[PDB]
């Protein structure tokens, strides 16, 4: 149900993650109080920082090009990140911190496409590694 898609095509790396609102902020309704409003703002703030969620090796020299965040109010969040990496061969793996910022997420269904090489894996808070 949290779904992460990763596609690497030359220097272009696309990461896209779709998550129900309960997986992101803890609730799917409109904030009821200041705590919930701050939780939503903090969550949206983190989603605009893909480098906190999906650390790319500095040796890959990945530049952020586009960030798209959609919130549909069940409610869900989609974050779509586009990087251009100068040294994409230096991108060996990603260690996601998704669960550190969004501990309500139990598991991620991940799909990885590196050129034409397709693989899937299920991540959890203790198994956050993705091979690229």
Author numbering: 39 to 111, 123, 185 to 242
From the paper:
ZrgA adopts a ferredoxin-like fold, albeit with different topology from the classic ferredoxin (fd), that bears no similarity to known SBPs.
Six protein molecules occupy the asymmetric unit, although the protein is purified exclusively as a monomer as determined by size exclusion chromatography. The beta-sandwich structures are virtually superimposable, although the long alpha helix is angled away from the central beta sheet by a few degrees in ZrgA relative to PA4063. The crystal structure of apo Δ124-184 ZrgA was nearly identical to PA4063, including the observation of unstructured regions at the N-terminus and His-rich loop.
